[PDB]
């Protein structure tokens, strides 16, 4: 397949991809605030997921999200409110496969369940690695805690 792309159409396709990226980047900026709130800090992860909350939403809508060892946060593709669902709020995390739109479940103080679909299998392996670190250590938080207050 890489062959196909190489000898057939590669360079002109990548010039057109130049053009398509330029078309996208010149349009909107509200996503910038979300990413700035997410980039490179105690926030372990920074990426976009299609979101299912409780049965409030049973249909996918791409949103933006945040992942701290102490909190999880999310925004609706440019939401004004930095919506907060902390690790200290949530009590479980699971992986769900909804019609090959693969997603990560989590259950919260509040009788809440959030289902967050990061797009494709590598992006999902990445976000699931970060969550299998972050909230599973928020569950291992119990056996990691006893050292830093007394």
């Amino acid at each position: 397949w890489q062959q196909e792309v190489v000898e057939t159409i590669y360079d002109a396709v990548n010039a057109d991809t130049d053009k398509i990226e330029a078309r996208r980047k010149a349009k909107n900026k509200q996503l910038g605030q979300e990413e700035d709130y997410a980039m490179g800090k105690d926030c372990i992860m920074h990426g976009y997921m299609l979101k299912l909350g409780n049965p409030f939403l049973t249909q996918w809508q791409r949103r933006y999200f945040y992942l701290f060892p102490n909190r999880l946060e999310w925004r609706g593709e440019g939401e004004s409110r930095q919506s907060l669902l902390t690790m200290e709020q949530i009590m479980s995390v699971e992986e769900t496969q909804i019609k090959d739109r693969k997603c990560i479940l989590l259950r919260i103080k509040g009788g809440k369940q959030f289902v967050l679909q990061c797009e494709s299998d590598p992006e999902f392996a990445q976000w699931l690695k970060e969550l299998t670190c972050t909230f599973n250590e928020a569950q291992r938080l119990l056996r990691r805690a006893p050292k830093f207050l007394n």
Binding site: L142, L149, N150
Partner: peptide, 11 residues
Amino acid sequence: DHKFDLMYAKR
């Protein structure tokens, strides 16, 4: 036991 561990870790 999990509860006892949560509520004994920090005394």
